[PDB]
Scaffold this active site. Structure first.
Site, PDB file in Angstrom:
ATOM      1  CD  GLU A 187      28.714  14.763  32.396  1.00 39.85           C
ATOM      2  OE1 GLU A 187      29.405  14.521  31.393  1.00 39.85           O
ATOM      3  OE2 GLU A 187      29.205  14.878  33.550  1.00 39.85           O
TER       4      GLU A 187
ATOM      5  CG  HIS B 171      33.186  10.895  31.928  1.00 42.05           C
ATOM      6  ND1 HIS B 171      32.026  10.694  32.639  1.00 42.05           N
ATOM      7  CD2 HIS B 171      33.079  12.123  31.373  1.00 42.05           C
ATOM      8  CE1 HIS B 171      31.253  11.761  32.530  1.00 42.05           C
ATOM      9  NE2 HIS B 171      31.866  12.636  31.759  1.00 42.05           N
ATOM     10  CD  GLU B 172      36.793  14.426  30.035  1.00 47.17           C
ATOM     11  OE1 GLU B 172      35.834  14.682  29.262  1.00 47.17           O
ATOM     12  OE2 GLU B 172      37.160  15.228  30.927  1.00 47.17           O
TER      13      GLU B 172
ATOM     14  CG  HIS C 113      31.767  13.528  26.984  1.00 43.52           C
ATOM     15  ND1 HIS C 113      30.411  13.357  27.181  1.00 43.52           N
ATOM     16  CD2 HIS C 113      32.267  13.975  28.157  1.00 43.52           C
ATOM     17  CE1 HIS C 113      30.118  13.640  28.439  1.00 43.52           C
ATOM     18  NE2 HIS C 113      31.228  14.021  29.040  1.00 43.52           N
TER      19      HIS C 113
HETATM   20 ZN   LIG Z   1      31.391  14.645  31.083  1.00 44.54          ZN
END
Ligand SMILES: [Zn+2]
Length: 215
Positions: free
Chosen positions: A177, A133-134, A137
Site C-alpha cells: 500500500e 493506485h490499482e 499494484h
Molecule cells: Zn491497494
C-alpha cells in the site's frame, strides 16, 4: 453487426475514441480496455489522461508484460471472474459495513479493473487516485517482481511512511500500500508530487527512477 473483438470490451486503440492529443496514447491504446456498451467519454478521458502522466517507459514495460486496465460502467462483481465476490465483505472491513459490490477497483494481476466515476478519494476507496493506485499494484507485482519486498524499499517504508501517512493505517502499515499510494502521489498532480517530495524525499527519488528497477 457486432464483432467478437468487441463483445467482452474494446481495446482503446480499436474503440474509435479520439485520444490523439493524449501523451503516450500509442502505448495506452494497447493497455486500456473501454466498455462495449454506453459509457461517459469524459470519465474515460480523465482516467486515460491521468494514466498518461506516467513515465512513458513504465507504460511500455506494462504493455510488453501484457498488463491491461479495463474500465467498467457496472460493478466489478458483475464480471464473471469476480462473481464469487458478490455480497461478500472485503478483507479489512468490518462485516456489514462494506461489500465487494461497493469496491470500485482491483489491481495486482495482469488485468486491472477500474469502475468509471470513482477516481477521487472517498468514492468507495481511500486512495488519492483509484486508477494510479490499482495500476501500481500490478506494476509492483509483475513488472518490478514484488519490489515492495526488497531491502531498499522496506527501509524507505520504515523511515518515511510515518512522515507521509501518519493518519492513514493501510498506507502506513502495509508495504504494498505504501508503494501504490506513493506512486499515485507522484503522478496524480504536481501538488501531490511535491507533498511526497517534502515528506518522503527518498521515496520520491525511488519512484522517480522506478523504471530502472524492472525485471
Ligand atoms: Zn491497494
Amino acid at each position: 453487426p457486432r464483432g467478437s473483438h468487441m463483445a467482452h470490451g474494446v481495446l482503446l486503440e480499436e474503440s474509435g475514441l479520439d485520444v490523439q492529443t493524449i501523451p503516450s496514447h500509442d502505448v495506452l491504446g494497447r493497455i486500456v480496455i473501454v466498455p462495449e456498451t454506453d459509457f461517459s467519454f469524459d470519465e474515460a478521458n480523465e482516467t486515460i489522461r491521468t494514466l498518461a502522466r506516467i513515465d512513458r517507459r513504465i507504460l511500455e514495460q506494462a504493455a510488453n508484460h501484457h498488463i491491461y486496465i479495463q474500465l467498467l460502467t457496472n460493478p466489478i462483481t458483475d464480471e464473471p471472474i469476480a462473481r464469487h465476490l458478490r455480497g461478500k465483505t472485503p478483507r479489512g472491513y468490518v462485516p456489514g459495513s462494506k461489500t465487494w459490490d461497493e469496491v470500485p477497483g482491483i489491481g495486482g494481476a495482469h488485468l486491472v479493473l477500474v469502475r468509471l466515476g470513482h477516481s477521487e478519494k472517498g468514492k468507495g476507496h481511500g486512495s488519492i487516485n483509484l486508477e494510479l493506485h490499482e495500476f501500481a499494484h500490478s506494476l509492483d507485482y509483475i513488472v518490478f517482481d514484488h519490489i515492495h519486498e526488497t531491502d531498499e524499499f522496506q527501509a524507505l517504508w520504515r523511515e518515511e511512511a510515518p512522515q507521509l501517512f501518519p493518519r492513514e493505517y493501510y498506507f502506513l502499515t502495509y508495504p504494498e500500500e505504501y508503494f501504490a499510494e506513493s506512486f499515485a502521489y507522484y503522478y496524480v498532480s504536481e501538488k501531490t508530487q511535491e507533498t511526497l517530495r517534502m515528506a518522503a524525499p527518498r521515496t520520491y527519488t525511488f519512484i522517480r527512477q522506478l523504471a530502472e528497477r524492472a525485471s
